[PDB]
Amino acid sequence: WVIP
Amino acid sequence: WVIP
Amino acid sequence: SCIQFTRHASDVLLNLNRLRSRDILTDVVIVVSREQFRAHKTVLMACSGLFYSIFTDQLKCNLSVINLDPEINPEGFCILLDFMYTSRLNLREGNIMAVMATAMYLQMEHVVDTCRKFIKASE
Amino acid sequence: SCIQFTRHASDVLLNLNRLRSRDILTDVVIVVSREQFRAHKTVLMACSGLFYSIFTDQLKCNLSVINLDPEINPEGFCILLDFMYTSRLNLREGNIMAVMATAMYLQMEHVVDTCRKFIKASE
């Protein structure tokens, strides 16, 4: 999971 | 396009 | 000896979401506490262990309407349906418990994992 | 304020290809010089400008069989159908002309671009  |  | 186009999977999903937003070739209604959500059976199966089991069943594969368990929160379902079509999860303090419970019911293992991690950080 | 799961689009496409390989929920047959290819209308539309135009047409959207132009090579189509479901293109010296012509007909702009570039390098 990432900060888009 | 890339070499997978 | 194949070549691979990096953005192809993302571009496919973006187009599938455009079809969903215009209600093109949607073949099922998911009913959650009277709220209705139109979707593509194939996308639902590709994202969820529960929908995969439902639509591979010889009788259920032909149903145009699927009613979820009454304990399922419509907002939790809506957030997860958006994630299925975009890879983006709108996880907030006020919805994390409903999102985790819906993801456990839908069998969306990666969503369950991130919810567990975010809850553990707050304790 | 969303979070994003990097591998989600790729995982969705992988599952859509697993459904194709088991012939689950395929809703159309594409006929190419008597050869037949089963697929999902939504995936075809998501990858191809030609299929997008066909299945948004009020009459054609309901067809279970689509016959392509007789000039279309079945091997070129098969390579492109594999690309649609995997992001991998099996481009070879012996098939590049048939793959480019089929991609131009199917309106798959990124495939047309890589074929043009590979052909230009060989001259």
Ligand SMILES: CSc1ncc(Cl)c(Nc2ccc3c(c2)CC(=O)N3)n1
């Ligand atoms: C297992 S083979 C397979 N073949 C095709 C499909 Cl459409 C599919 N979907 C599916 C099954 C289980 C799970 C998911 C999707 C997401 C998750 O967390 N668990 N699985």
Ligand SMILES: CSc1ncc(Cl)c(Nc2ccc3c(c2)CC(=O)N3)n1
């Ligand atoms: C343009 S809006 C839109 N909405 C939904 C879909 Cl399913 C779609 N597909 C599509 C259209 C044109 C092209 C492709 C896909 C690949 C390509 O090279 N050209 N387009």
Ligand SMILES: [Cl-]
């Ligand atoms: Cl029904």
Ligand SMILES: [Cl-]
């Ligand atoms: Cl998931």
Ligand SMILES: [Cl-]
């Ligand atoms: Cl027909």
Ligand SMILES: [Cl-]
């Ligand atoms: Cl393309």
